[PDB]
Amino acid sequence: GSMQIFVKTLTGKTITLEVEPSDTIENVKAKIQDKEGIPPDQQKLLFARKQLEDGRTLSDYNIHKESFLYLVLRL
Amino acid sequence: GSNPLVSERLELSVLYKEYDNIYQQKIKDLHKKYSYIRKTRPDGNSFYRAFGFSHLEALLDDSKELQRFKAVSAKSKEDLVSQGFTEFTIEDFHNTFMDLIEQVEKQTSVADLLASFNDQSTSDYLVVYLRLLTSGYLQRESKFFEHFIEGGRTVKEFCQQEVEPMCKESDHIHIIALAQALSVSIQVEYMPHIFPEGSEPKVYLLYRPGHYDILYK
């Protein structure tokens, strides 16, 4: 947690997360889990209409502070 | 008929007697918030057929909510047309939809309403139009929903592949679009999302992999 980003769900809910610029995607999904009770294996995150992959960092996708991630559930 | 489009209203006791002991507890978790169950045919049209019956059935007890649902639904045809749809293509689907609303307005029995939902032509014409409403809203709000759809397809291409065709089962993007297009709130239980967020759910559904059923409190 060094910067702030927002995660958007299809219901219209906005989730505020505190993240490190070098956080892996699954660490972002982990933060979403211990805040929304949603298993990371159900989470699918999009940025600029591209799915974010486990193992890659936020900085790999040029995701900076106050950015918006979009969350769609698999099932 | 062993496989009707919409079944009779039942008690959820037939959820044990369909099943795995880890699943047995969550029905008790469900029996404390839901008393009854109505089933739809698992054909990929479950969500729309479940929603359609649940709301129309509820409107028998609310004349004033019926009137605005009727007003929204009546305008919806020309509304789809203005945004690219062919009036002549969607005409009869919309009319069957308005026809069911009129039946509810004239206080049709619940038994007769169920019969209409079990007529293949009538019940599927309904689902077709609900899919067109959903697709119409998605394309209309393409800027919003683009964020949730992976690159490679426009919202329109997504609609023509995943929403408009029959047999295509619904997920969260279908539910929010229909809930916003018709301005009625929907809550889904699994085996608790509210569409849209921060609203009071009027339609209660149960979701099992690729299938939706109607829940009653």
From Swiss-Prot, chain A:
Membrane topology: Peripheral membrane protein
Top-level taxon of the source organism: Eukaryota
Annotated Ubiquitin-like domain residues: 3-75
Modification comment: Phosphorylated ubiquitin specifically binds and activates parkin (PRKN), triggering mitophagy. Phosphorylation does not affect E1-mediated E2 charging of ubiquitin but affects discharging of E2 enzymes to form polyubiquitin chains. It also affects deubiquitination by deubiquitinase enzymes such as USP30.
Subcellular location: Cytoplasm; Nucleus; Mitochondrion outer membrane
Protein purpose: Exists either covalently attached to another protein, or free (unanchored). When covalently bound, it is conjugated to target proteins via an isopeptide bond either as a monomer (monoubiquitin), a polymer linked via different Lys residues of the ubiquitin (polyubiquitin chains) or a linear polymer linked via the initiator Met of the ubiquitin (linear polyubiquitin chains).
Name the UniProt record assigns to this protein: Ubiquitin
Record lineage: Eukaryota, Metazoa, Chordata, Craniata, Vertebrata
Swiss-Prot record, chain B:
Coiled coil: none
Any single biological process term in GO: protein deubiquitination
Marked site (Interacts with free ubiquitin) residue numbers: 176, 190, 207, 212
Catalytic residues identified in the record: 43, 46 (nucleophile), 211
Expression tissues: Isoform 1 is ubiquitous. Isoform 2 is expressed only in lymphoid tissues such as tonsils, lymph nodes and spleen, as well as peripheral blood mononuclear cells.
Annotated OTU domain residues: 35-217
Outcome of mutating residue 92 to G: Impairs inhibition of UBE2N/UBC13
Keywords from the UniProt entry: Acetylation, Adaptive immunity, Cytoplasm, DNA damage, DNA repair, Hydrolase, Immunity, Phosphoprotein, Protease, Thiol protease, Ubl conjugation pathway
Catalytic activity: Thiol-dependent hydrolysis of ester, thioester, amide, peptide and isopeptide bonds formed by the C-terminal Gly of ubiquitin (a 76-residue protein attached to proteins as an intracellular targeting signal)
Chain intervals for the UniProt region annotation (Ubiquitin-conjugating enzyme E2 binding): 85-93, 124-132, 161-168
Chief site of localization: cytoplasm
A molecular-function term among this protein's GO annotations: ubiquitin binding
Name of the top EC class for this enzyme: hydrolase
Region (Free ubiquitin binding): 144-150, 169-176, 192-197
Compartments it resides in: Cytoplasm
Means of activity regulation: By free ubiquitin: binding of free ubiquitin triggers conformational changes in the OTU domain and formation of a ubiquitin-binding helix in the N-terminus, promoting binding of the conjugated donor ubiquitin in UBE2N/UBC13 to OTUB1.
Enzyme Commission number(s): 3.4.19.12
Domain notes from UniProt: Distinct binding sites for the ubiquitins may allow to discriminate among different isopeptide linkages (i.e. 'Lys-48'-, 'Lys-63'-linked polyubiquitin) in polyubiquitin substrates and achieve linkage-specific deubiquitination.
Subunit composition and interactions: Interacts with FUS and RACK1. Interacts with UBE2D1/UBCH5A, UBE2W/UBC16 and UBE2N/UBC13.
Functional note: Hydrolase that can specifically remove 'Lys-48'-linked conjugated ubiquitin from proteins and plays an important regulatory role at the level of protein turnover by preventing degradation. Regulator of T-cell anergy, a phenomenon that occurs when T-cells are rendered unresponsive to antigen rechallenge and no longer respond to their cognate antigen. Acts via its interaction with RNF128/GRAIL, a crucial inductor of CD4 T-cell anergy. Isoform 1 destabilizes RNF128, leading to prevent anergy. In contrast, isoform 2 stabilizes RNF128 and promotes anergy.
Family membership noted in the UniProt record: Belongs to the peptidase C65 family.
Name the UniProt record assigns to this protein: Ubiquitin thioesterase OTUB1
Organism of derivation: Homo sapiens (Human)
Residue window of the full protein shown: 45 to 271 of 271
